[PDB]
Amino acid sequence: KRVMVIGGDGYCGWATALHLSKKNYEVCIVDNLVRRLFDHQLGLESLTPIASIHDRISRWKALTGKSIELYVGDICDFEFLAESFKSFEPDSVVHFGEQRSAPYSMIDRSRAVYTQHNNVIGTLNVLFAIKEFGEECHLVKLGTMGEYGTPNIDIEEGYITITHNGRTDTLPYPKQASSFYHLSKVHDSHNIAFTCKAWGIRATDLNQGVVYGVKTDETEMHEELRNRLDYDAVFGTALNRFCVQAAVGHPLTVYGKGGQTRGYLDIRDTVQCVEIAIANPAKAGEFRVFNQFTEQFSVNELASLVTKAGSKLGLDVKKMTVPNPRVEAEEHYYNAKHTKLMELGLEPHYLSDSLLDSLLNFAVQFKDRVDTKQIMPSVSWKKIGVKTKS
Amino acid sequence: KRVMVIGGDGYCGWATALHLSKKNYEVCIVDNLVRRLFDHQLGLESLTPIASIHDRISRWKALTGKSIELYVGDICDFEFLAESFKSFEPDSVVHFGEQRSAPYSMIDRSRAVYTQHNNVIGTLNVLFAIKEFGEECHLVKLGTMGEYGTPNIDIEEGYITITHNGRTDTLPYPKQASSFYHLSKVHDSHNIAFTCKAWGIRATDLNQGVVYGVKTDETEMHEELRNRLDYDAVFGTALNRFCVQAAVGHPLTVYGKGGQTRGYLDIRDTVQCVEIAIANPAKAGEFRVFNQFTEQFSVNELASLVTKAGSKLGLDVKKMTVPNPRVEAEEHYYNAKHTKLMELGLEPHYLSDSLLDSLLNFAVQFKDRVDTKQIMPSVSWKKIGVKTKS
Numbered sequence: 197k198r199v200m201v202i203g204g205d206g207y208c209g210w211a212t213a214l215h216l217s218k219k220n221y222e223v224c225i226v227d228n229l230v231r232r233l234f235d236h237q238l239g240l241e242s243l244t245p246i247a248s249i250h251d252r253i254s255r256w257k258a259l260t261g262k263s264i265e266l267y268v269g270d271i272c273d274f275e276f277l278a279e280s281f282k283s284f285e286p287d288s289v290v291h292f293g294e295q296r297s298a299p300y301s302m303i304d305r306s307r308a309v310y311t312q313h314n315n316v317i318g319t320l321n322v323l324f325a326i327k328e329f330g331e332e333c334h335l336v337k338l339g340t341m342g343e344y345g346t347p348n349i350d351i352e353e354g355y356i357t358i359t360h361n362g363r364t365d366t367l368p369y370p371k372q373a374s375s376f377y378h379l380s381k382v383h384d385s386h387n388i389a390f391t392c393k394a395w396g397i398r399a400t401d402l403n404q405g406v407v408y409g410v411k412t413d414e415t416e417m418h419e420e421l422r423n424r425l426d427y428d429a430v431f432g433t434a435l436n437r438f439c440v441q442a443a444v445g446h447p448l449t450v451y452g453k454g455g456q457t458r459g460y461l462d463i464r465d466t467v468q469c470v471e472i473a474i475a476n477p478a479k480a481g482e483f484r485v486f487n488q489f490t491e492q493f494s495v496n497e498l499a500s501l502v503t504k505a506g507s508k509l510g511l512d513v514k515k516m517t518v519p520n521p522r523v524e525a526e527e528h529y530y531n532a533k534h535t536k537l538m539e540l541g542l543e544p545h546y547l548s549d550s551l552l553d554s555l556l557n558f559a560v561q562f563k564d565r566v567d568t569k570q571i572m573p574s575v576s577w578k579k580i581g582v583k584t585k586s
Numbered sequence: 587k588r589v590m591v592i593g594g595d596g597y598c599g600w601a602t603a604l605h606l607s608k609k610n611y612e613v614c615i616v617d618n619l620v621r622r623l624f625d626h627q628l629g630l631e632s633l634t635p636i637a638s639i640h641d642r643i644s645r646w647k648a649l650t651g652k653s654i655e656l657y658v659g660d661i662c663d664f665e666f667l668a669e670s671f672k673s674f675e676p677d678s679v680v681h682f683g684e685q686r687s688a689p690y691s692m693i694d695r696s697r698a699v700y701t702q703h704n705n706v707i708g709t710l711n712v713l714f715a716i717k718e719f720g721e722e723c724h725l726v727k728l729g730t731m732g733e734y735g736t737p738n739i740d741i742e743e744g745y746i747t748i749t750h751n752g753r754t755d756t757l758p759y760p761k762q763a764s765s766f767y768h769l770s771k772v773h774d775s776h777n778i779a780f781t782c783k784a785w786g787i788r789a790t791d792l793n794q795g796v797v798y799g800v801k802t803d804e805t806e807m808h809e810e811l812r813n814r815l816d817y818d819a820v821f822g823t824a825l826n827r828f829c830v831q832a833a834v835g836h837p838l839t840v841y842g843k844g845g846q847t848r849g850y851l852d853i854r855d856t857v858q859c860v861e862i863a864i865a866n867p868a869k870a871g872e873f874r875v876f877n878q879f880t881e882q883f884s885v886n887e888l889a890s891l892v893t894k895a896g897s898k899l900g901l902d903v904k905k906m907t908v909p910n911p912r913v914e915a916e917e918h919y920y921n922a923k924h925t926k927l928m929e930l931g932l933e934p935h936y937l938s939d940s941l942l943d944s945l946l947n948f949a950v951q952f953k954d955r956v957d958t959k960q961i962m963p964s965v966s967w968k969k970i971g972v973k974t975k976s
């Protein structure tokens with residue numbers, strides 16, 4: 197099967213591209229590498245140095261003999277997207293190619309607008325390319341667990357059966373995103389759902405939880421295949437950030453009360469889940485929604501786990517309460533359902549002492565490359581302005 | 587109070603601008619007049635000839651002495667929007683400035699993309715301008731009854747209290763839009779809701795039903811104040827279209843079975859409802875949602891009413907079943923709640939024999955200007971392509 201991995205130079209995308217290639221799918225990467233430009237523009241950098249996309253692909257070929265095709269361009273440019281689609285003829289498209297940082301989407305008006313335009317229009321272009329050049333192509337889209345917000349009821353996998361005023365129906369689960377980025381994903385999902393019904397498009401919305409980890413079987417095969425590990429306050433996420441903080445001796449940055457609860461999963465399960473979604477495709481006109489995560493953790497819980505893990509390495513981990521830059525519930529009910537992927541055969545890598553030990557040791561050995569100036573958050577949800585920030 | 591009417595040269599906007607001015611609000615119109623360009627580009631034309639926005643405003647001033655300020659520009663251009671906002675300093679902003687045609691949004695990829703970009707980004711710009719230049723400014727947004735789709739349960743006014751797995755919560759009503767235009771409104775609503783919570787913005791989402799009629803007290807005061815009446819298959823809507831069809835002797839174009847049910851309201855109630863929303867503003871951080879319509883009608887019901895009304899004028903109205911160009915339920919349950927505006931004092935103009943007689947006679951007297959080539963729909967929801975159509 198032929199798979200087009202949009203956003204394949206990214207964190208989830210690169211790991212996924214290699215895995216699918218290893219699993220014998222014909223693979224191509226469609227990416228404009230704008231994420232790398234963001235690093236330069238904001239003064240950010242991955243904990244570990246990564247190779248250029250060209251050297252990454254060249255190394256994979258040198259090691260395995262397998263060639264991952266590369267199309268460098270902006271999917272918002274339909275001419276480029278159309279040519280890439282016609283040239284590659286994918287059977288499946290995995291869409292990781294979007295501005296995914298919540299903080300980034302809240303920097304200022306221009307970045308909030310860029311986030312929504314890039315994400316929503318790019319996804320519309322993908323739907324139109326599938327419809328026009330390969331209507332049977334299965335779209336595996338990365339949505340977000342953030343689409344559901346934190347309601348006082350159980351979170352289902354995309355749909356909910358409601359009995360209202362004596363009548364019953366199964367409707368899309370109410371969405372309550374808390375950032376312009378999270379909102380763009382909600383828009384994506386609604387747009388895709390419509391095309392499934394109107395055009396018979398087949399798609400799977402993967403509402404993934406926060407990803408942690410840097411190693412996967414494929415990326416560890418050579419230094420040039422190494423994935424990125426972000427720890428800064430813009431693109432870095434909770435667990436990965438805490439591990440790097442522990443390694444450099446910086447107190448764990450708990451935003452607000454720390455009761456914020458979310459689903460999490462090892463990057464190794466990210467690639468596994470995407471492969472399962474590709475191997476067991478949605479039917480024509482079907483809009484599948486999977487809650488893609490393996491375990492739920494509160495920020496405080498992650499803090500304790502990293503502290504305990506850090507102790508075994510004599511890191512004497514400390515914690516600190518950072519005035520929350522975000523607007524969100526810091527104490528809330530959280531029970532998100534996740535059985536669809538398990539039902540399809542998912543064999544999860546639950547968070548372990550071994551994983552934390554590995555990730556912490558990894559951070560310690562590259563600690564010299566950590567720019568501590570990027571650890572504390574400087575993007576306010578409430579103070580967001582119109583002047584383009586530098 | 588000062589009111590900024592974005593989209594004030596349009597059908598709902600012009601009638602509303604005049605009404606608010608008459609009601610003694612200081613009013614300005616922000617419009618790029620792109621709707622007029624669409625008419626030229628698609629070969630469409632209003633049943634009745636309308637004056638230029640400049641002559642419209644000049645006439646109002648000549649008659650009443652009141653001056654409606656005019657800012658001509660694209661709200662997607664923040665520089666222009668920011669300058670207009672700072673120059674006018676509105677206490678309320680009524681947002682009618684969006685691509686509102688469902689068929690238009692389905693013409694091809696470029697038009698679907700234009701619809702979502704123009705609508706979503708323009709609305710984001712409005713929210714940022716309010717936040718930055720007048721945070722207390724009340725946003726009265728035009729959403730759409732189409733956001734709810736046609737579920738098997740009662741449709742509430744924006745929110746629904748659900749009891750799921752033994753827990754209760756009031757959540758946003760599940761959205762199921764059936765066109766790229768309707769979808770853009772869903773995105774708008776989700777975006778606005780977020781800013782109300784994150785920034786304390788105060789807004790009222792007016793999910794209006796289909797509007798019918800051409801006369802309002804103000805627009806009838808002089809020919810140059812005349813509003814537009816669309817009958818073509820792109821911008822024309824059900825009732826208005828049927829009345830013009832009856833007048834020219836064209837069979838009423840019933841799409842599919844004709845069981846499609848929706849809420850409707852006289853344009854006179856449109857201006858009344860907007861004024862009520864402005865006079866009784868939302869509180870800081872509040873996202874009010876009103877279902878703005880006065881009565882529910884199926885297409886078949888409208889067909890019968892127009893036929894009966896046309897009989898009294900000896901029009902011998904005929905009906906025809908047109909293969910539905912749209913993907914939608916042609917027979918469905920429909921019970922949409924609408925009491926919030928009534929509770930705030932709305933005095934509705936329910937559809938009457940008098941209204942139909944007036945509108946039909948109006949169409950008959952301008953029947954010579956009707957381009958019958960534009961009556962039948964030529965935009966398919968399913969056959970939509972990527973090539974920009976001419």
Ligand SMILES: NC(=O)c1ccc[n+]([C@@H]2O[C@H](COP(=O)([O-])OP(=O)(O)OC[C@H]3O[C@@H](n4cnc5c(N)ncnc54)[C@H](O)[C@@H]3O)[C@@H](O)[C@H]2O)c1
Pocket residue numbers: 202203204205206207208209226227228229230231232269270271272291292293294295296314318338339340404405406407408433
């Ligand atoms: N990182 C996590 O913790 C996490 C968690 C859940 C879901 N996801 C989701 O997975 C997806 C990818 O995330 P990631 O962490 O790998 O992000 P990333 O920023 O590392 O990768 C995204 C890639 O997409 C590319 N891209 C962006 N816009 C593009 C465009 N217009 N055209 C072509 N390419 C474009 C970027 O250059 C980049 O290489 C996103 O949808 C994200 O929300 C990630």
Ligand SMILES: NC(=O)c1ccc[n+]([C@@H]2O[C@H](COP(=O)([O-])OP(=O)(O)OC[C@H]3O[C@@H](n4cnc5c(N)ncnc54)[C@H](O)[C@@H]3O)[C@@H](O)[C@H]2O)c1
Pocket residue numbers: 592593594595596597598599616617618619620621622659660661662681682683684685686704708728729730794795796797798823
């Ligand atoms: N017509 C109806 O039956 C109906 C029904 C329910 C809701 N509404 C809603 O009311 C609003 C206005 O509808 P209408 O029928 O008056 O439409 P219209 O096309 O007559 O008016 C819209 C106006 O907005 C302007 N506009 C569009 N994009 C703009 C931009 N980027 N910058 C500045 N101005 C811009 C256009 O030039 C036009 O004058 C829409 O949100 C619509 O969905 C209309």
Ligand SMILES: O=c1ccn([C@@H]2O[C@H](COP(=O)(O)OP(=O)(O)O[C@H]3O[C@H](CO)[C@@H](O)[C@H](O)[C@H]3O)[C@@H](O)[C@H]2O)c(=O)[nH]1
Pocket residue numbers: 296297298299339340341342404405406407432433434435437438449450451452454456457458495522524
């Ligand atoms: O140092 C930190 C970082 C985060 N948080 C909190 O932990 C939670 C999770 O935040 P984070 O790890 O930054 O993830 P999100 O901002 O939710 O976003 C990531 O995880 C989402 C999961 O849905 C994806 O959609 C996004 O693309 C991805 O960037 C939030 O409550 C944060 O406020 C902290 O307390 N301390």
Ligand SMILES: O=c1ccn([C@@H]2O[C@H](COP(=O)(O)OP(=O)(O)O[C@H]3O[C@H](CO)[C@@H](O)[C@H](O)[C@H]3O)[C@@H](O)[C@H]2O)c(=O)[nH]1
Pocket residue numbers: 686687688689729730731732794795796797822823824825827828839840841842844846847848885912914
């Ligand atoms: O000649 C016609 C025209 C329409 N319909 C049907 O009647 C219904 C209503 O359609 P229409 O009057 O075209 O309205 P919408 O496309 O729903 O859109 C209008 O009414 C919406 C109400 O929510 C607004 O959001 C939009 O901006 C406005 O363009 C639909 O089921 C149509 O398929 C017919 O059967 N025959």
